[PDB]
């Protein structure tokens, strides 16, 4: 199981940007997909997942105005294994969001914690200037 | 749901429609032979269960402990994270060992129970 | 981050290492459960506890979370170098999101 | 007593003689011999599994959760019990068994779901 | 550590009650070929039936072991429990009671009519 994602991107302030998280060696519908926010004044803080299967979106209301999640179909590998992609969009950048920016894999389907990560991509840099 | 359609659900989740599963002259020649293994299938599965006490249930717990060599997973590993199709190939090279184990129990368990009964 | 832990906490290798994470009584810890993370600076996270009682899989027997009303806590047997990491608190729900705590940062004496 | 000797008997008579009759339902020309085999087999097995779907498997008698809906029949117990037979009274519920049928095996699922918990 | 099939026949009776599973698995698993073969199917379904009817009638089905409220008749044998249990194969102890057995299963049949109706009895007292 891994996920890759967008390098890192400059972006003027106002601007919009779109990362990308390429996932595979697991099923795509099967499990959660997690935005991760990491800024040095906030720390950690989660942005919000969207399910691969049903479309269904939990925001926190910090981002709920702002970021805008989509999946795409996921095309099989092995019965048990499937490739896709999770994108995100943060519209209207602010030098508050710039941070190392993390998409990670849910950890397991009809438990209490469904949608906790399990595991994450290597994350990437977003900075703004103006 | 229907029939098998629990299949791409969790192991857990489908515990709640074993219910629904449980259930279910050329021409007339190979309905014949088709009438004969339908119900060769039905008992092999009855003649287990009726062996294993379990006859009647569609969940009977048992006396045999788990062995983790069998699997290492953790309950929640197990119930929720698994299909029964994926489960059912972890445990391929062992499933004929543990319904010896649920056997031998069985007869133990009878023979005790005979005994209990005797001193009565 | 309504949650908070102690700035660091430290030991000599080989000890054992507690970490607390706190609240308001509203947000930890009834009704709700408390996941723990290493999170490496410049690295992905590697997470460690689930609901506040069990290891994740592929986690090193060592580790082990503790769960009361008013707080809940981890840790660390064997205190080994791998572990001079930062870590952090999270409360969730099944219906609600992660709220990450302030951190902690583990130290080795010696 | 014999097979089916107690048929013309009262129902609470006939009572006495359930394993009388559960006894001997098992036991070119090669085919229709066996058609004929394979088909006493059949009933058989088809009686025994909707015992099982009633949870009333291995029971000569079983009681279940299924009220009696006076509709089928107004009858008291003593008039049913004591001055009718077998094969006048399923003669009297012959349309309404097929609905009696599903009730007892939809009252099984709702106990199987009990015993779960 | 299993004898294997039939591996107990010659074992005293009170041992081969410890192999009953063994048995008790395999009695469905073990043109004019063809023919043959389908008569051998339905036989071993009619032969694993056969045993199985008499135990759903006396109530013991589901259970290897089967105690019942007949008594015992000096009659069909006037051995003490060693002299079976601990002196005989139960290939032996088929012969001796071998003109009973219809006997013996019909009493077990009406005993067990007659306890179903009981608890039909007293269940309706409640
Ligand atoms: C195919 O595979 C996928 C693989 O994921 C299967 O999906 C998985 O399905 C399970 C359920 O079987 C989900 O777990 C449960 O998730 C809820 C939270 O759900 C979030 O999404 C909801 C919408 O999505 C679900 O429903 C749609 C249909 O409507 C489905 O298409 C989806 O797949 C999902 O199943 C949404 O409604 C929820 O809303 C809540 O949060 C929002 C946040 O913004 C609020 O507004 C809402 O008001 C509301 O609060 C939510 O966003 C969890 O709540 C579940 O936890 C309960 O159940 C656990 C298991 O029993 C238990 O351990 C927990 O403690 C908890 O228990 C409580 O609820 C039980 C159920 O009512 C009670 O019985 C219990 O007593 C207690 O009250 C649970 O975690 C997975 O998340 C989902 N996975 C993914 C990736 O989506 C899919 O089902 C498979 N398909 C088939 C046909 O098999
Ligand atoms: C085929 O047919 C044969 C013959 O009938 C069957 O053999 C019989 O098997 C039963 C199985 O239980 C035997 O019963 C037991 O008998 C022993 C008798 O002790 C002798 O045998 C021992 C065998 O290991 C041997 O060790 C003994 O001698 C050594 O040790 C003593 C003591 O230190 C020493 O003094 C000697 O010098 C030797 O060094 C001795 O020769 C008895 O000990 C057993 O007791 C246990 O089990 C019973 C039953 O559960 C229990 O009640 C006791 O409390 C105790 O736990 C047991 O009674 C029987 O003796 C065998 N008969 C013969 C003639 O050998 C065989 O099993 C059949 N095969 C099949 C496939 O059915
Ligand atoms: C839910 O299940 C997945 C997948 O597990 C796979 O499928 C299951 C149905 C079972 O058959 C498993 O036996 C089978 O592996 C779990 O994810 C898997 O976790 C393992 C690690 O525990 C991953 O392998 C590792 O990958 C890392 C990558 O850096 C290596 O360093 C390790 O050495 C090791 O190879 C594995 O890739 C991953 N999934 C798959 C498809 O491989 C998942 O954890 C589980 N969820 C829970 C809560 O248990
Ligand atoms: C064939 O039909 C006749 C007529 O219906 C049956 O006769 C009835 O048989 C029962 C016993 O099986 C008799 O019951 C007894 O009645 C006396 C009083 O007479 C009572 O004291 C006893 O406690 C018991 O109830 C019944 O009287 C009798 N009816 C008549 C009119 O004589 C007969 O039994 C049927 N045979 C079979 C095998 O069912
Ligand atoms: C598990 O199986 C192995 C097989 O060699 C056996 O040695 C071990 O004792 C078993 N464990 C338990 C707890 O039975
Ligand atoms: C079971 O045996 C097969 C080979 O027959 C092997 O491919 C498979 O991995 C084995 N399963 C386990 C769990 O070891
Ligand atoms: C015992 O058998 C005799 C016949 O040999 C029979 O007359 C007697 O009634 C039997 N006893 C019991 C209690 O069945
Ligand atoms: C069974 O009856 C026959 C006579 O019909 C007799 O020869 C035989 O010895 C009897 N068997 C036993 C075990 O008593």
């Known amino acids: 199981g891994q996920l890759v994602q967008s390098g890192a991107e400059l972006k003027k302030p106002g601007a919009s940007v779109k990362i990308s998280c390429k996932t595979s060696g697991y099923r795509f519908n099967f499990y959660h997909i997690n935005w991760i926010r990491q800024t040095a004044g906030r720390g950690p803080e989660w942005m919000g997942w969207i399910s691969p299967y049903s479309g269904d979106k939990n925001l926190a209301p910090a981002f709920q105005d702002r970021v805008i999640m989509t999946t795409d179909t996921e095309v099989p590998v092995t019965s048990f294994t499937s490739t896709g992609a999770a994108y995100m969009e943060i519209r209207n950048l602010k030098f508050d969001d710039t941070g190392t920016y993390f998409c990670?894999?849910?950890?397991?389907?009809?438990?209490?914690?469904?949608?906790?990560?399990?595991?994450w991509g290597q994350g990437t840099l977003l900075t703004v200037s103006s | 749901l229907g029939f098998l359609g629990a299949a791409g659900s969790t192991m857990g989740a489908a515990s709640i429609t074993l219910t629904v599963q449980a259930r279910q002259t050329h021409w007339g020649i190979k309905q014949l032979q088709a009438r004969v293994l339908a119900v060769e299938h039905y008992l092999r599965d009855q003649q287990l269960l009726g062996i294993w006490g379990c006859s009647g249930k569609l969940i009977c717990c048992t006396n045999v402990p788990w062995n983790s060599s069998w699997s290492n997973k953790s309950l929640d590993e197990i119930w929720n994270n698994m299909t029964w199709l994926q489960w059912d190939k972890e445990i391929n090279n062992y499933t004929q060992l543990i319904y010896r184990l649920i056997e031998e129990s069985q007869n133990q368990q009878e023979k005790n129970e005979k005994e209990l009964l005797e001193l009565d | 981050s309504v949650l908070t832990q102690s700035a660091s906490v430290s030991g000599s290798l080989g000890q054992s290492v507690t970490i607390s994470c706190t609240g308001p009584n509203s947000v930890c810890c009834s009704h709700k459960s408390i996941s723990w993370y290493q999170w490496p600076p410049g690295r992905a996270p590697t997470l460690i506890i689930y609901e506040d009682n069990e290891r994740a899989p592929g986690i090193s027997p060592r580790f082990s979370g503790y769960k009361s009303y008013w707080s809940a806590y981890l840790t660390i047997s064997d205190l080994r170098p791998e572990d001079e990491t930062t870590y952090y608190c999270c409360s969730y729900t099944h219906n609600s999101g992660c709220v990450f705590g302030t951190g902690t940062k583990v130290s080795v004496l010696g | 007593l014999g097979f089916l000797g107690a048929a013309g008997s009262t129902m609470g008579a006939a009572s006495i003689t359930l394993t009388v009759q559960a006894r001997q339902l098992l036991s070119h020309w090669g085919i229709k011999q066996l058609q004929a085999r394979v088909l006493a087999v059949e009933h058989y097995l088809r009686d025994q599994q909707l015992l099982g779907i009633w949870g009333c498997s291995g029971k000569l008698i079983c009681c279940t959760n299924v009220p009696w809906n006076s509709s089928w029949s107004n009858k008291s117990l003593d008039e049913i019990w004591n001055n009718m037979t077998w094969l006048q009274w399923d003669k009297e519920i012959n349309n309404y068994t097929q609905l009696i049928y599903r009730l007892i095996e939809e009252s099984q699922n709702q106990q199987e779901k009990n015993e779960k918990e | 550590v299993s004898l294997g099939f039939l591996g107990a026949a010659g074992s005293t009776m009170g041992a081969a009650s410890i192999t009953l599973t063994v048995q008790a698995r395999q009695l469905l698993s073990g043109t004019h070929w063809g023919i043959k073969q389908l008569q051998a199917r339905v036989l071993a379904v009619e032969h694993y039936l056969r045993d199985q009817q008499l135990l759903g009638i006396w109530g013991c089905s589901g259970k290897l072991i089967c105690c019942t409220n007949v008594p015992w008749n000096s009659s069909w044998s006037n051995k003490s429990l060693d002299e079976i249990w601990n002196n005989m194969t139960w290939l032996q102890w088929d012969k001796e009671i071998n003109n009973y057995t219809q006997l013996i299963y019909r009493l077990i049949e009406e005993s067990q009519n007659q306890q179903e109706k009981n608890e039909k009895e007293l269940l309706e007292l409640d």
């Open positions: 990670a894999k849910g950890l397991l389907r009809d438990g209490s914690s469904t949608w906790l990560p399990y595991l």
